[PDB]
Amino acid sequence: SILNDYKRKTEGSVFWAQRARSVMPDGAFDPHGLFISDAQGVHKTDVDGNVYLDFFGGHGALVLGHGHPRVNAAIAEALSHGVQYAASHPLEVRWAERIVAAFPSIRKLRFTGSGTETTLLALRVARAFTGRRMILRFEGTTANTLLIRPDDIEGMREVFANHGSDIAAFIAEPVGSHFGVTPVSDSFLREGAELARQYGALFILDEVISGFRVGNHGMQALLDVQPDLTCLAKASAGGLPGGILGGREDVMGVLSRGSFTGNPITAAAAIAAIDTILEDDVCAKINDLGQFAREAMNHLFARKGLNWLAYGRFSGFHLMPGLPPNTTDTGSITRAEVARPDVKMIAAMRMALILEGVDIGGRGSVFLSAQHEREHVEHLVTTFDRVLDRLADENLLSWQGT
Numbered sequence: 001s002i003l004n005d006y007k008r009k010t011e012g013s014v015f016w017a018q019r020a021r022s023v024m025p026d027g028a029f030d031p032h033g034l035f036i037s038d039a040q041g042v043h044k045t046d047v048d049g050n051v052y053l054d055f056f057g058g059h060g061a062l063v064l065g066h067g068h069p070r071v072n073a074a075i076a077e078a079l080s081h082g083v084q085y086a087a088s089h090p091l092e093v094r095w096a097e098r099i100v101a102a103f104p105s106i107r108k109l110r111f112t113g114s115g116t117e118t119t120l121l122a123l124r125v126a127r128a129f130t131g132r133r134m135i136l137r138f139e140g141t142t143a144n145t146l147l148i149r150p151d152d153i154e155g156m157r158e159v160f161a162n163h164g165s166d167i168a169a170f171i172a173e174p175v176g177s178h179f180g181v182t183p184v185s186d187s188f189l190r191e192g193a194e195l196a197r198q199y200g201a202l203f204i205l206d207e208v209i210s211g212f213r214v215g216n217h218g219m220q221a222l223l224d225v226q227p228d229l230t231c232l233a234k235a236s237a238g239g240l241p242g243g244i245l246g247g248r249e250d251v252m253g254v255l256s257r258g259s260f261t262g263n264p265i266t267a268a269a270a271i272a273a274i275d276t277i278l279e280d281d282v283c284a285k286i287n288d289l290g291q292f293a294r295e296a297m298n299h300l301f302a303r304k305g306l307n308w309l310a311y312g313r314f315s316g317f318h319l320m321p322g323l324p325p326n327t328t329d330t331g332s333i334t335r336a337e338v339a340r341p342d343v344k345m346i347a348a349m350r351m352a353l354i355l356e357g358v359d360i361g362g363r364g365s366v367f368l369s370a371q372h373e374r375e376h377v378e379h380l381v382t383t384f385d386r387v388l389d390r391l392a393d394e395n396l397l398s399w400q401g402t
Contacts, residue, residue: 017033078268092264320338341363
Protein backbone atom coordinates (compact mmCIF):
# COMPACT_ATOMS: atom_id res chain seq x y z
CA SER A 1 0.00 0.00 0.00
CA ILE A 2 1.01 3.69 -0.41
CA LEU A 3 1.07 4.10 3.37
CA ASN A 4 3.31 1.07 4.02
CA ASP A 5 5.59 1.89 1.06
CA TYR A 6 5.84 5.49 2.59
CA LYS A 7 6.77 4.05 6.09
CA ARG A 8 9.52 1.90 4.55
CA LYS A 9 11.00 4.74 2.54
CA THR A 10 11.05 7.18 5.47
CA GLU A 11 12.05 5.15 8.61
CA GLY A 12 14.66 7.79 9.50
CA SER A 13 11.79 10.35 9.57
CA VAL A 14 9.59 8.05 11.74
CA PHE A 15 12.53 7.86 14.19
CA TRP A 16 12.88 11.69 14.55
CA ALA A 17 9.07 12.06 14.56
CA GLN A 18 8.97 10.04 17.81
CA ARG A 19 11.51 12.29 19.45
CA ALA A 20 9.46 15.25 18.25
CA ARG A 21 6.34 13.85 19.59
CA SER A 22 7.66 13.73 23.19
CA VAL A 23 8.43 17.49 23.01
CA MET A 24 5.79 18.97 20.62
CA PRO A 25 2.00 18.78 20.70
CA ASP A 26 1.00 16.43 17.84
CA GLY A 27 0.48 15.86 14.00
CA ALA A 28 0.22 19.41 7.81
CA PHE A 29 0.23 15.50 7.69
CA ASP A 30 -1.52 12.21 9.12
CA PRO A 31 1.06 9.31 9.63
CA HIS A 32 4.16 11.50 10.02
CA GLY A 33 6.05 14.04 7.96
CA LEU A 34 9.41 14.37 6.38
CA PHE A 35 12.61 15.39 8.23
CA ILE A 36 14.88 17.22 6.02
CA SER A 37 18.55 17.54 6.45
CA ASP A 38 19.72 19.30 3.13
CA ALA A 39 18.46 21.40 0.37
CA GLN A 40 19.99 23.17 -2.73
CA GLY A 41 18.19 24.73 -5.66
CA VAL A 42 15.02 22.74 -6.31
CA HIS A 43 16.07 19.61 -4.44
CA LYS A 44 15.94 18.55 -0.81
CA THR A 45 17.20 15.45 0.97
CA ASP A 46 15.54 13.76 3.94
CA VAL A 47 17.24 12.07 6.92
CA ASP A 48 17.21 8.76 4.94
CA GLY A 49 19.18 10.20 2.16
CA ASN A 50 16.22 10.29 -0.29
CA VAL A 51 16.36 13.25 -2.71
CA TYR A 52 13.17 15.00 -3.75
CA LEU A 53 12.23 17.54 -6.40
CA ASP A 54 10.65 20.31 -4.31
CA PHE A 55 7.71 22.48 -5.25
CA PHE A 56 6.89 24.06 -1.88
CA GLY A 57 9.73 24.39 0.74
CA GLY A 58 9.71 27.97 2.12
CA HIS A 59 5.93 28.50 1.46
CA GLY A 60 6.87 31.00 -1.17
CA ALA A 61 9.76 32.77 0.59
CA LEU A 62 12.20 30.99 -1.68
CA VAL A 63 11.45 32.64 -4.89
CA LEU A 64 15.03 32.03 -5.80
CA GLY A 65 15.19 28.43 -4.55
CA HIS A 66 17.10 26.79 -1.73
CA GLY A 67 20.43 28.34 -0.90
CA HIS A 68 20.98 30.54 -3.97
CA PRO A 69 24.82 31.38 -4.15
CA ARG A 70 24.65 35.13 -4.21
CA VAL A 71 22.12 35.02 -1.28
CA ASN A 72 24.53 32.80 0.70
CA ALA A 73 27.66 34.85 -0.06
CA ALA A 74 25.82 37.97 1.13
CA ILE A 75 24.69 36.24 4.35
CA ALA A 76 28.22 34.92 5.15
CA GLU A 77 29.77 38.34 4.36
CA ALA A 78 27.33 39.84 6.87
CA LEU A 79 27.83 37.23 9.52
CA SER A 80 31.64 37.77 9.50
CA HIS A 81 30.92 41.37 10.73
CA GLY A 82 29.29 39.89 13.81
CA VAL A 83 26.25 42.26 14.06
CA GLN A 84 23.20 40.19 14.47
CA TYR A 85 20.89 42.66 16.22
CA ALA A 86 21.60 46.25 14.74
CA ALA A 87 20.63 49.73 16.15
CA SER A 88 21.03 51.12 12.76
CA HIS A 89 23.05 49.39 10.12
CA PRO A 90 23.81 50.59 6.51
CA LEU A 91 22.45 47.24 5.03
CA GLU A 92 19.16 47.71 6.69
CA VAL A 93 18.96 51.24 5.09
CA ARG A 94 19.96 49.85 1.69
CA TRP A 95 17.27 47.20 1.94
CA ALA A 96 14.57 49.79 2.76
CA GLU A 97 15.76 51.75 -0.31
CA ARG A 98 14.89 48.81 -2.65
CA ILE A 99 11.57 48.46 -1.03
CA VAL A 100 10.59 52.15 -1.46
CA ALA A 101 12.00 51.87 -5.04
CA ALA A 102 9.76 48.78 -5.88
CA PHE A 103 6.51 49.90 -4.24
CA PRO A 104 5.48 53.46 -5.26
CA SER A 105 2.91 53.39 -2.51
CA ILE A 106 5.59 52.80 0.13
CA ARG A 107 7.17 56.17 1.04
CA LYS A 108 8.19 55.19 4.50
CA LEU A 109 8.50 51.85 6.28
CA ARG A 110 9.32 50.11 9.51
CA PHE A 111 10.98 46.69 9.75
CA THR A 112 9.41 43.99 11.97
CA GLY A 113 10.08 40.53 13.31
CA SER A 114 7.79 38.66 10.86
CA GLY A 115 4.62 38.61 8.62
CA THR A 116 2.34 38.18 11.48
CA GLU A 117 3.75 41.11 13.46
CA THR A 118 3.50 43.16 10.21
CA THR A 119 -0.33 42.75 9.74
CA LEU A 120 -0.84 43.22 13.46
CA LEU A 121 1.15 46.43 13.51
CA ALA A 122 -0.69 47.59 10.37
CA LEU A 123 -4.00 47.14 12.15
CA ARG A 124 -2.72 49.32 15.11
CA VAL A 125 -1.32 51.97 12.90
CA ALA A 126 -4.73 52.07 11.07
CA ARG A 127 -6.59 52.37 14.32
CA ALA A 128 -4.42 55.09 15.72
CA PHE A 129 -4.36 57.14 12.56
CA THR A 130 -8.12 57.13 11.99
CA GLY A 131 -9.33 57.18 15.54
CA ARG A 132 -11.57 54.20 14.56
CA ARG A 133 -11.99 50.83 16.23
CA MET A 134 -13.26 48.24 13.61
CA ILE A 135 -11.20 46.27 11.16
CA LEU A 136 -12.74 44.71 8.04
CA ARG A 137 -11.30 41.39 6.81
CA PHE A 138 -12.27 38.21 4.76
CA GLU A 139 -13.33 34.78 5.84
CA GLY A 140 -10.90 31.84 6.43
CA THR A 141 -11.34 40.92 20.29
CA THR A 142 -13.45 39.69 17.41
CA ALA A 143 -16.38 42.16 18.29
CA ASN A 144 -13.81 44.62 16.66
CA THR A 145 -13.58 42.65 13.41
CA LEU A 146 -15.93 42.69 10.51
CA LEU A 147 -15.93 39.66 8.13
CA ILE A 148 -16.84 39.79 4.48
CA ARG A 149 -16.89 36.90 2.03
CA PRO A 150 -14.48 37.07 -0.92
CA ASP A 151 -16.09 38.42 -4.09
CA ASP A 152 -19.26 39.54 -2.23
CA ILE A 153 -19.23 43.04 -3.75
CA GLU A 154 -22.65 43.90 -2.60
CA GLY A 155 -22.24 42.46 0.94
CA MET A 156 -19.16 44.80 1.21
CA ARG A 157 -21.04 47.97 -0.02
CA GLU A 158 -23.36 47.07 2.83
CA VAL A 159 -20.78 46.65 5.55
CA PHE A 160 -19.46 50.18 4.85
CA ALA A 161 -22.88 51.84 4.53
CA ASN A 162 -23.82 50.08 7.84
CA HIS A 163 -20.51 50.44 9.96
CA GLY A 164 -18.44 52.45 7.55
CA SER A 165 -17.75 55.50 9.66
CA ASP A 166 -16.27 53.12 12.41
CA ILE A 167 -13.86 51.14 10.12
CA ALA A 168 -10.18 51.87 10.64
CA ALA A 169 -9.08 49.54 7.85
CA PHE A 170 -9.98 47.06 5.19
CA ILE A 171 -7.21 44.48 5.08
CA ALA A 172 -6.98 42.01 2.15
CA GLU A 173 -4.60 39.48 0.68
CA PRO A 174 -4.50 39.62 -3.06
CA VAL A 175 -4.99 36.62 -5.37
CA GLY A 176 -6.62 35.06 -2.25
CA SER A 177 -5.98 33.24 1.02
CA HIS A 178 -2.56 31.42 0.90
CA PHE A 179 -1.79 32.92 -2.55
CA GLY A 180 -5.23 31.87 -3.92
CA VAL A 181 -6.29 28.60 -2.22
CA THR A 182 -9.56 30.58 -1.83
CA PRO A 183 -9.55 32.94 -4.85
CA VAL A 184 -10.57 36.64 -4.68
CA SER A 185 -11.00 38.81 -7.69
CA ASP A 186 -8.98 41.82 -8.41
CA SER A 187 -12.14 43.84 -9.15
CA PHE A 188 -13.42 43.09 -5.58
CA LEU A 189 -10.11 44.48 -4.10
CA ARG A 190 -10.32 47.47 -6.36
CA GLU A 191 -13.86 48.03 -5.06
CA GLY A 192 -12.85 47.58 -1.47
CA ALA A 193 -10.01 50.13 -1.95
CA GLU A 194 -12.48 52.73 -3.47
CA LEU A 195 -15.02 52.03 -0.71
CA ALA A 196 -12.39 52.34 2.04
CA ARG A 197 -11.25 55.69 0.65
CA GLN A 198 -14.82 56.98 0.23
CA TYR A 199 -15.73 56.09 3.90
CA GLY A 200 -12.36 57.35 5.31
CA ALA A 201 -10.94 53.83 6.07
CA LEU A 202 -7.48 52.83 5.15
CA PHE A 203 -6.84 50.07 2.77
CA ILE A 204 -4.19 47.61 3.79
CA LEU A 205 -2.82 45.27 1.16
CA ASP A 206 -1.04 42.10 2.49
CA GLU A 207 1.68 41.40 -0.04
CA VAL A 208 3.57 38.97 2.18
CA ILE A 209 3.39 36.32 -0.54
CA SER A 210 2.85 38.58 -3.56
CA GLY A 211 5.80 40.76 -2.89
CA PHE A 212 8.72 40.18 -5.12
CA ARG A 213 6.98 37.16 -6.53
CA VAL A 214 4.08 38.34 -8.80
CA GLY A 215 6.07 41.30 -10.20
CA ASN A 216 8.82 43.81 -9.53
CA HIS A 217 6.25 46.44 -8.14
CA GLY A 218 4.00 44.13 -6.34
CA MET A 219 0.52 43.11 -6.92
CA GLN A 220 -0.49 46.65 -6.17
CA ALA A 221 1.01 47.90 -9.38
CA LEU A 222 -0.85 45.09 -11.26
CA LEU A 223 -4.12 45.95 -9.60
CA ASP A 224 -3.51 49.69 -10.12
CA VAL A 225 -4.37 50.49 -6.55
CA GLN A 226 -2.39 52.54 -4.04
CA PRO A 227 -2.92 51.04 -0.59
CA ASP A 228 -2.38 53.13 2.46
CA LEU A 229 -0.18 50.36 4.07
CA THR A 230 1.44 47.34 2.52
CA CYS A 231 2.67 44.28 4.53
CA LEU A 232 5.68 42.46 3.16
CA ALA A 233 7.88 39.50 4.22
CA LYS A 234 9.21 36.28 2.72
CA ALA A 235 10.77 37.06 -0.64
CA SER A 236 10.94 40.74 0.20
CA ALA A 237 13.15 39.62 3.12
CA GLY A 238 15.28 37.40 0.97
CA GLY A 239 13.95 34.26 2.47
CA LEU A 240 15.08 34.99 5.99
CA PRO A 241 12.95 35.91 8.90
CA GLY A 242 11.52 39.41 9.25
CA GLY A 243 8.71 41.64 8.00
CA ILE A 244 8.20 45.13 6.59
CA LEU A 245 5.27 47.53 7.01
CA GLY A 246 5.38 50.35 4.57
CA GLY A 247 2.90 53.07 3.61
CA ARG A 248 2.20 56.73 2.98
CA GLU A 249 4.05 59.37 5.25
CA ASP A 250 0.90 60.55 6.97
CA VAL A 251 -0.10 57.13 8.24
CA MET A 252 3.47 55.86 8.74
CA GLY A 253 3.91 59.12 10.71
CA VAL A 254 1.90 57.59 13.56
CA LEU A 255 4.78 55.36 14.33
CA SER A 256 8.05 56.28 16.00
CA ARG A 257 6.37 59.43 17.53
CA GLY A 258 3.17 59.25 19.72
CA SER A 259 0.14 58.05 17.53
CA PHE A 260 13.29 47.54 16.04
CA THR A 261 15.23 49.13 13.07
CA GLY A 262 16.31 45.89 11.28
CA ASN A 263 18.42 42.75 11.27
CA PRO A 264 21.57 43.10 9.11
CA ILE A 265 21.83 39.43 8.15
CA THR A 266 18.31 39.41 6.77
CA ALA A 267 19.05 42.72 5.18
CA ALA A 268 22.04 41.35 3.29
CA ALA A 269 19.92 38.36 2.01
CA ALA A 270 17.21 40.64 0.87
CA ILE A 271 19.45 43.01 -0.98
CA ALA A 272 21.07 40.04 -2.73
CA ALA A 273 17.69 38.43 -3.47
CA ILE A 274 15.90 41.60 -4.64
CA ASP A 275 18.82 42.47 -6.95
CA THR A 276 18.94 38.92 -8.48
CA ILE A 277 15.11 38.91 -8.91
CA LEU A 278 15.29 42.28 -10.84
CA GLU A 279 18.35 41.48 -12.83
CA ASP A 280 17.49 37.91 -13.88
CA ASP A 281 13.82 38.78 -14.80
CA VAL A 282 12.71 36.16 -12.23
CA CYS A 283 9.06 37.21 -11.90
CA ALA A 284 8.40 36.90 -15.63
CA LYS A 285 10.03 33.48 -15.74
CA ILE A 286 8.10 31.97 -12.85
CA ASN A 287 4.80 33.48 -13.99
CA ASP A 288 5.46 31.62 -17.37
CA LEU A 289 6.27 28.43 -15.68
CA GLY A 290 3.14 28.64 -13.51
CA GLN A 291 0.90 29.06 -16.49
CA PHE A 292 2.57 26.23 -18.20
CA ALA A 293 2.17 23.93 -15.10
CA ARG A 294 -1.51 24.81 -14.78
CA GLU A 295 -2.30 24.00 -18.39
CA ALA A 296 -0.22 20.82 -18.31
CA MET A 297 -1.92 19.60 -15.15
CA ASN A 298 -5.39 20.35 -16.61
CA HIS A 299 -4.53 18.53 -19.81
CA LEU A 300 -3.36 15.60 -17.73
CA PHE A 301 -6.62 15.39 -15.85
CA ALA A 302 -8.71 15.62 -19.06
CA ARG A 303 -6.65 12.97 -20.74
CA LYS A 304 -7.00 10.58 -17.77
CA GLY A 305 -10.72 11.13 -17.54
CA LEU A 306 -10.66 12.85 -14.02
CA ASN A 307 -12.75 15.64 -12.70
CA TRP A 308 -9.95 17.54 -10.85
CA LEU A 309 -8.84 21.11 -11.54
CA ALA A 310 -5.53 22.84 -11.21
CA TYR A 311 -6.26 26.55 -10.56
CA GLY A 312 -4.46 29.78 -9.49
CA ARG A 313 -2.27 32.45 -10.86
CA PHE A 314 1.25 33.58 -11.37
CA SER A 315 3.95 31.30 -10.08
CA GLY A 316 1.54 28.88 -8.40
CA PHE A 317 -1.32 26.45 -8.51
CA HIS A 318 -3.70 24.64 -6.24
CA LEU A 319 -5.73 21.53 -6.80
CA MET A 320 -9.43 21.08 -6.56
CA PRO A 321 -10.69 17.49 -6.83
CA GLY A 322 -14.35 17.60 -7.94
CA LEU A 323 -14.21 20.11 -10.73
CA PRO A 324 -13.68 19.54 -14.40
CA PRO A 325 -10.27 20.57 -15.67
CA ASN A 326 -11.80 23.07 -18.18
CA THR A 327 -13.33 25.20 -15.31
CA THR A 328 -12.44 28.96 -15.91
CA ASP A 329 -14.57 30.44 -13.27
CA THR A 330 -13.52 29.43 -9.71
CA GLY A 331 -16.53 31.00 -8.24
CA SER A 332 -17.59 27.64 -6.84
CA ILE A 333 -14.38 27.57 -4.82
CA THR A 334 -14.46 31.15 -3.67
CA ARG A 335 -18.14 30.52 -2.40
CA ALA A 336 -17.30 27.11 -0.83
CA GLU A 337 -19.80 25.23 -2.91
CA VAL A 338 -17.31 22.45 -3.81
CA ALA A 339 -17.22 19.36 -1.56
CA ARG A 340 -14.10 19.26 0.76
CA PRO A 341 -11.69 16.66 -0.71
CA ASP A 342 -11.40 13.45 1.28
CA VAL A 343 -8.52 13.88 3.72
CA LYS A 344 -7.28 10.24 3.31
CA MET A 345 -7.16 10.76 -0.41
CA ILE A 346 -5.05 13.98 0.07
CA ALA A 347 -2.75 12.27 2.46
CA ALA A 348 -2.20 9.39 0.12
CA MET A 349 -1.52 11.77 -2.70
CA ARG A 350 1.12 13.50 -0.71
CA MET A 351 2.80 10.16 0.30
CA ALA A 352 2.57 8.80 -3.17
CA LEU A 353 4.26 11.87 -4.58
CA ILE A 354 7.04 11.56 -2.06
CA LEU A 355 7.43 7.86 -3.11
CA GLU A 356 8.04 9.07 -6.55
CA GLY A 357 10.70 11.63 -5.38
CA VAL A 358 8.52 14.75 -5.52
CA ASP A 359 7.04 16.99 -2.79
CA ILE A 360 4.38 19.64 -2.90
CA GLY A 361 2.58 21.55 -0.03
CA GLY A 362 -0.63 21.42 1.96
CA ARG A 363 -3.54 19.75 0.14
CA GLY A 364 -2.05 20.14 -3.33
CA SER A 365 -0.32 23.49 -3.69
CA VAL A 366 2.88 24.39 -5.52
CA PHE A 367 5.08 27.45 -5.64
CA LEU A 368 7.57 27.74 -8.40
CA SER A 369 10.95 29.27 -8.15
CA ALA A 370 13.65 30.79 -10.24
CA GLN A 371 15.66 27.66 -10.46
CA HIS A 372 12.64 25.50 -11.72
CA GLU A 373 12.62 24.71 -15.46
CA ARG A 374 10.04 23.32 -17.75
CA GLU A 375 11.64 19.90 -17.42
CA HIS A 376 10.82 19.98 -13.64
CA VAL A 377 7.15 20.73 -14.44
CA GLU A 378 7.06 17.92 -16.93
CA HIS A 379 8.47 15.60 -14.25
CA LEU A 380 5.72 16.81 -11.86
CA VAL A 381 3.08 16.00 -14.43
CA THR A 382 4.49 12.52 -15.10
CA THR A 383 4.79 11.73 -11.45
CA PHE A 384 1.10 12.93 -10.89
CA ASP A 385 -0.08 10.67 -13.65
CA ARG A 386 1.29 7.71 -11.71
CA VAL A 387 0.07 9.05 -8.33
CA LEU A 388 -3.44 9.35 -9.65
CA ASP A 389 -3.25 5.61 -10.79
CA ARG A 390 -2.14 4.59 -7.29
CA LEU A 391 -5.01 6.57 -5.73
CA ALA A 392 -7.55 4.77 -7.96
CA ASP A 393 -5.80 1.41 -7.04
CA GLU A 394 -6.79 2.17 -3.42
CA ASN A 395 -10.31 3.51 -4.47
CA LEU A 396 -9.54 6.95 -3.10
CA LEU A 397 -10.82 8.78 -6.22
CA SER A 398 -14.58 9.72 -6.42
CA TRP A 399 -15.49 10.52 -10.10
CA GLN A 400 -18.98 11.93 -9.27
CA GLY A 401 -19.63 15.65 -8.27
CA THR A 402 -21.92 17.38 -5.58
